[PDB]
Amino acid sequence: DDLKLPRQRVDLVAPPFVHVHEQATKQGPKIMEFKLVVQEKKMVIDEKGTTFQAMTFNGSMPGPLMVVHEGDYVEVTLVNPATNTMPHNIDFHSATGALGGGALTLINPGEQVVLRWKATRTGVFVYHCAPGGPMIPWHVVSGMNGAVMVLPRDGLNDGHGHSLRYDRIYYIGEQDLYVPRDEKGNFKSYDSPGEAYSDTEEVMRKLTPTHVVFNGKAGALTGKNALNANVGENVLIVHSQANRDSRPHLIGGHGDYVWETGKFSNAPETGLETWFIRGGSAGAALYKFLQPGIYAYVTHNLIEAANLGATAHFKVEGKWNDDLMTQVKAPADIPTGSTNE
Amino acid sequence: DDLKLPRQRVDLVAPPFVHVHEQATKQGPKIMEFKLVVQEKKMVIDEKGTTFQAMTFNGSMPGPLMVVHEGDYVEVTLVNPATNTMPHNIDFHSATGALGGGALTLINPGEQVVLRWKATRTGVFVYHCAPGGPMIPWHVVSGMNGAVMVLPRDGLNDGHGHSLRYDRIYYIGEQDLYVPRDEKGNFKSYDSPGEAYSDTEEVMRKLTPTHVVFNGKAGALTGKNALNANVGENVLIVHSQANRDSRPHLIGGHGDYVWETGKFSNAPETGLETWFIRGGSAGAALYKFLQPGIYAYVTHNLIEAANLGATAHFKVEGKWNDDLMTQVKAPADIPTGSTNE
Amino acid sequence: DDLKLPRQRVDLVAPPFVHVHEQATKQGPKIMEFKLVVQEKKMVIDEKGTTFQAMTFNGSMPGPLMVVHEGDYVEVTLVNPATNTMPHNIDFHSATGALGGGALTLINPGEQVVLRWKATRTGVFVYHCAPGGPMIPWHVVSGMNGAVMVLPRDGLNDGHGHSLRYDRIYYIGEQDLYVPRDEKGNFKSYDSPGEAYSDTEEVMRKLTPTHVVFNGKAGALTGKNALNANVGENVLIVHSQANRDSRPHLIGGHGDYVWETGKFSNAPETGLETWFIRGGSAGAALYKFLQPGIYAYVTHNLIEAANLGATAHFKVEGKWNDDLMTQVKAPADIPTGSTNE
Ligand SMILES: OC[C@H]1O[C@@](CO)(O[C@H]2O[C@H](CO)[C@@H](O)[C@H](O)[C@H]2O)[C@@H](O)[C@@H]1O
Ligand SMILES: OC[C@H]1O[C@@](CO)(O[C@H]2O[C@H](CO)[C@@H](O)[C@H](O)[C@H]2O)[C@@H](O)[C@@H]1O
Ligand SMILES: OC[C@H]1O[C@@](CO)(O[C@H]2O[C@H](CO)[C@@H](O)[C@H](O)[C@H]2O)[C@@H](O)[C@@H]1O
Ligand SMILES: OC[C@H]1O[C@@](CO)(O[C@H]2O[C@H](CO)[C@@H](O)[C@H](O)[C@H]2O)[C@@H](O)[C@@H]1O
Ligand SMILES: OC[C@H]1O[C@@](CO)(O[C@H]2O[C@H](CO)[C@@H](O)[C@H](O)[C@H]2O)[C@@H](O)[C@@H]1O
Ligand SMILES: OC[C@H]1O[C@@](CO)(O[C@H]2O[C@H](CO)[C@@H](O)[C@H](O)[C@H]2O)[C@@H](O)[C@@H]1O
Ligand SMILES: O=N[O-]
Ligand SMILES: O=N[O-]
Ligand SMILES: O=N[O-]
Ligand SMILES: O=N[O-]
Ligand SMILES: O=N[O-]
Ligand SMILES: O=N[O-]
């Protein structure tokens, strides 16, 4: 027991929600204990019921958000149950050495491993499976990726000596999928990940996804699963993309404070319309809602947003501010005395 | 008449030019009144005369640049003449609430609507049509997008307490187009936007444009329509892309001061070779010309620039500075006594 | 002899190595003399032995890194031997005027030209061939691109008044290639660049590369050609992409200080997981190695990294730090008393 710090078990929750945590803390460094269980399973990924052979951490795309503070030690039990067919591992972009932990965590079905890494760098970071060679992109685009957030011990700041505090936090994991089609253009179904591999690799090689989804399926965060907020609330939106660039945009809002490279040692940019998550990274945006109603959160490639599945909804409760925006005149017939050339 | 401010009618001009405005102002907030008229029409988009079914604000791709100051109110009359076939609306990324105004501006052919928004955020911002669902990307990539610039009341600054002033301003709207081809690879023609839709949506789904153009067509800002400047002039180039990333580059120049995320609350970067406009955003670059001659302004995917139409020209008048650059020896035969391995 | 400064001949070396230079200097401005010789040749670009008709500066993809200091004059002899078949030229993104020098350097086979430019802007910059029209993207994606680094005379700093010094420097040139295939999907071979052109242009038009390589071929910087470093060394990695965006990531490390737009007048960002090189630019990242072992340097589109060739290796010598990372429990059978749902 060389490392004599208090230990604290964390129970992960399914995205887009985030386990209980403190923003600012005066506790010393702890050993934060997390468990991730690999689950290979068929999942539905679009509103027409298209299925595909997914591989996940904890049964979700993305994998759950892990939240720790700078100077904590993160002790991760990775479990690969004997119902799975492939070896798996985990690479933390937040960690230093051994390919992020990938070189120390390769496990066959029936095995588990315990990795500890010190959280020396603040920000939001991708974690993903990375077995070796062509298996790396295949496991990642099959759904084996998540994020970890390392907060400063004093919580967030605006980079100019003022504290920032969120009222609410959501984790939006964006996934690019490569689903094979038959000669007529219909999506193909398979009975195992292994059977899907050869056809999937051919789609992957052309670098155009068939689907781009938040929280694992088209429409996952719309309708009854819309994200909730209130006028006046400061909401932190963590966005990750393990493989492909994304350009997040809150329709009818802004990013008040945006870390687009996702690292809290850098001052955020202010008042962004659209921001940029580079493939293999996580970013974060803080917005204070000023108007009630429906907001669409999209990647602002609008083809991907509207036609390939990458749209989420916020439903915001509160009172409308007619000073910020108003309909002066409702739709009406163009006046007869109008000239419109 | 709850809002008791002076009103000022603005006459928009066709890009790449920009309506008359002040950089710094000591006038108080005004209500700035703008009119936009939707026009569906067939347009030529390449040097071989390829046509396509365009939908525009004010008959231009992009739509015109609107210029206001922080704290102004922007009162927009959107008109959809009864010669058009579809409903249209407008979403301002500069505005707060109701999906940027899209939720308050949906109009059938024969109708108009008046929206007012307060310009609370500085920078350059995209505006675009967004009717609903798959119609959103289709109207945007059919040409229904423009930009608005909200200046600080004191005009631009370098983020370190020094004022920046432009001698000239150009608005470069970049458009990704998806023109269907027949089995032999020739571009198809249609008699209406509706007839084009199904074939166009199939091209859009593969996320590779057939054309990438500035000011609505290949070669629009070359030859006689080259942009003019003089040695010593500080030129502001506003660049927008409503749907797809762009990487602007002034060949033979630099970006002296670049807001690549396009928001004037952030200090510009200095001395850039190439900058990055994320899809769904506008950016701005200031350059002071130091040499006369021809400059190519490109997206630095050179395939898109040279082969898909995304090249503009500046013709700069003045005297050559042999200290910055000189041809020491004109092309000449390789000397006989040379070794070149 | 209007310009009366000392002259210094520089001998270029093949990437990923960099010719001898000083970081900080108290010497005055010099005329730094460089020679580049164009070589058209067939080259192997993947581990299955696929060939393609390359065009290079000095026989390498990328062309060699040129290192000068702010205020130096750069005098470049470009040579196009009569064994070549096409005209060539050179465009320096670091230079001011005449399309970066392209308008002053067009040479037929059998000819040479001498261009001088003043290094007024600090950073790393792309140089590339740019003959005219569709020849521009074709020569660049055929391999005619490199980089130049203009150091501040005081060397690098962290943008907050502290000097940064590298122990080692590597230049990673990333190349997107467009190799035509036959009806069965096999790569086609040609006897000249001219014969390859028409088929290559068709692949280029679809904006999806067949290969994405560092230092001119898949696996070039793996195995015995891995890059060397030691625990504690500050390593500068210069990354260029003349045509297409890249998202560099050091697997198991970070970017301690990153200039992603590549310009030393801007303070670097700190502690990045993944950074972004916009097509037509060079960037630079400083990392201090903290752990020994193998590191993969990738573009974090993992399909491109693992399947299209864009992976390099660092082999780092030193002692493992179990405080930063440790395997707490080696792979072992899942305990019988475990529940993993
Ligand atoms: O800011 C650059 C800086 O990062 C350093 C801190 O000096 O290290 C990072 O990772 C180290 C891991 O032990 C920690 O010292 C530090 O907490 C963290 O930011 C250096 O390698 C470098 O100067
Ligand atoms: O996309 C090609 C072609 O395939 C069809 C079916 O023959 O539709 C498939 O692809 C659509 C777009 O991805 C999906 O909406 C659908 O689930 C799938 O069957 C054609 O409609 C289409 O042109
Ligand atoms: O800088 C973050 C900041 O943006 C704020 C200003 O405090 O609001 C922006 O939009 C508001 C709209 O009413 C204005 O107060 C302000 O002018 C504008 O920059 C906050 O929501 C937040 O602190
Ligand atoms: O692009 C496929 C194929 O189509 C042809 C005509 O059969 O040319 C078409 O596409 C070209 C590239 O977009 C255009 O230059 C031209 O306007 C259009 O007819 C072939 O030339 C080409 O290989
Ligand atoms: O920082 C903006 C600044 O760039 C300037 C310097 O004032 O010029 C750049 O290129 C010039 C070439 O002669 C040099 O004066 C200078 O060294 C370099 O940074 C201006 O054009 C502008 O203010
Ligand atoms: O990629 C299409 C198709 O072509 C084949 C050969 O018929 O393989 C070629 O393409 C592969 C991927 O680029 C290369 O690995 C190989 O060098 C080349 O022959 C098929 O394997 C493939 O499905
Ligand atoms: O030690 N108090 O949180
Ligand atoms: O399966 N994803 O939330
Ligand atoms: O471990 N990969 O299939
Ligand atoms: O009030 N003067 O501009
Ligand atoms: O039609 N565009 O300028
Ligand atoms: O309103 N859309 O076609």
Ligand SMILES: O=N[O-]
């Ligand atoms: O002048 N001394 O380096």
Ligand SMILES: O=N[O-]
């Ligand atoms: O040929 N490239 O190093």
Ligand SMILES: O=N[O-]
């Ligand atoms: O000079 N171009 O082939």
Ligand SMILES: [Cu+2]
């Ligand atoms: Cu896996």
Ligand SMILES: [Cu+2]
């Ligand atoms: Cu990774």
Ligand SMILES: [Cu+2]
């Ligand atoms: Cu419309």
Ligand SMILES: [Cu+2]
């Ligand atoms: Cu939008």
Ligand SMILES: [Cu+2]
């Ligand atoms: Cu050339």
Ligand SMILES: [Cu+2]
């Ligand atoms: Cu260039």
